Amino acid sequence: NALRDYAEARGIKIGTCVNYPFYNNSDPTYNSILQREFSMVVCENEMKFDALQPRQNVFDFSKGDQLLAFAERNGMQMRGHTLIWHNQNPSWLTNGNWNRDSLLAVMKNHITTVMTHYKGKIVEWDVANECMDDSGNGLRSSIWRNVIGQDYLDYAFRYAREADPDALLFYNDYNIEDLGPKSNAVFNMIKSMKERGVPIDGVGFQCHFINGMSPEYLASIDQNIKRYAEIGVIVSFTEIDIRIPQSENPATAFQVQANNYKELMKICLANPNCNTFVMWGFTDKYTWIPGTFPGYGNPLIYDSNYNPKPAYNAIKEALM
């Protein structure tokens, strides 16, 4: 009767990022729900560049190996998040003296060392994360973009494919789910990469949405998934959360949130190239939402006291 049982029956993996209390065992209830309801896990912060390579050529696999061991004894798959990003880079990198050639070497060593340590054990990898400018006009300026040049992502994907040829490689971003300018910029980027022989398998829709999604908005996400299928690309929902304005009445806002979660799951079930449904946490107790969007909160399927919210049953109903 767990969410993972109904999901498995439908050929969908349902997952969540794992928050910090998991590691130090400070929240037993958190761990008991985690091992019971989900079939997929992702590291919230422990596999980012600064965590994995804190000093030049020094790799810390402790937390990632601890999560993988837990996943394996619980019959769960794991997503790798994330190799190349403009945020959370260690000081030795951001303050170093680089040129195109020396930075490409650092990129290749990071990608190869991390992926070979987990070779064949991680099914989907977010190779690159949030690299498109919010305007949709082109790539965002970052240490990788500015130093290497406009083709830096072609190298990241090639290096990744060489490191683990069995891993599905993803480009992950936010505000690319509909048919707006940023979404169109990412689709054309991925379509072009494939036409030039760059190995890219999927696109990760972060799904950081606001409560009260309209049917037309939801309809545009479905059409966007279909155009990716036409170019042979798979889609994963990677960091789903549905934020609620602090001022909305909780009781009725939770009902709207439940319907939005239900509709998202129906879109996943209707598209053969979209079979991964990962939420950015599962209890309102632990969430990055308030810090990035002050005034918003309660974005998940269990409340702060671990009582399932209407959204939990709504997802279970869509799966049935």
For 94-162, the DSSP string reads: HTS---HHHHHHHHHHHHHHHHHHTTTT-SEEEEEES-B-TTSSSBPP-HHHHHH-TTHHHHHHHHHHH
φ/ψ of residue 117, rounded to 5: -60, -35
What whole-number distance in Å separates Cα of residue 296 and Cα of residue 299? Answer: 8
Dig out the tokens for 313 from the structure.
């049953």
For 24-37, the DSSP string reads: HT--HHHHHHHHHH
> What is the chain's percent helix, strand, coil content, to nearest 5?
45, 20, 35
Is residue 99 packed enough to be buried (19+ CB in 10 Å), middle (13-18) or exposed (0-12)?
exposed
Rg (CA), the chain: 19
| Host domain of residue 288 | 1-320
Place of tokens 């934020």: 243
**Farthest CA pair distance, the chain:** 56
The total number of structural domains in the chain stands at: 1
Dig out the tokens for 16 from the structure.
């969540």
C-beta separation of 159 from 198 below 8 A: no
Q: Under 8 Å CB-to-CB from 314, ≥6 apart: which residues?
A: 258, 259, 261, 262
Output the domain CATH number for residue 11: 3.20.20.80
C-beta separation of 155 from 107 below 8 A: yes
Residue 149, phi-psi category: left (phi > 0), alpha (psi -120 to 50), beta (remainder): left
Long-range contacts of 147-154 (CB under 8 A, 24+ apart): 147/98, 147/99, 147/100, 147/103, 148/100, 148/103, 148/104, 148/107, 149/100, 152/107, 153/84, 153/128, 153/193, 153/198, 154/193, 154/196, 154/198
Place of tokens 């869509």: 318
What whole-number distance in Å separates Cα of residue 143 and Cα of residue 145? Answer: 6
C-beta separation of 256 from 298 below 8 A: no
φ/ψ of residue 141, rounded to 5: -75, 140
φ/ψ of residue 70, rounded to 5: -65, -45
Q: How many CB atoms lie within 10 A of CB 149?
A: 12
Element spanning 220, H or E: helix 215-230
234-245 and 296-297: which strand pairing?
A: antiparallel
Per-residue DSSP letter, 76:
-
Residue 212, phi-psi category: left (phi > 0), alpha (psi -120 to 50), beta (remainder): left
Q: Which residues are catalytic?
A: 130, 239
Element spanning 223, H or E: helix 215-230
Place of tokens 């997503």: 79
Instruction: Residue count of the chain, please give it.
Output: 320
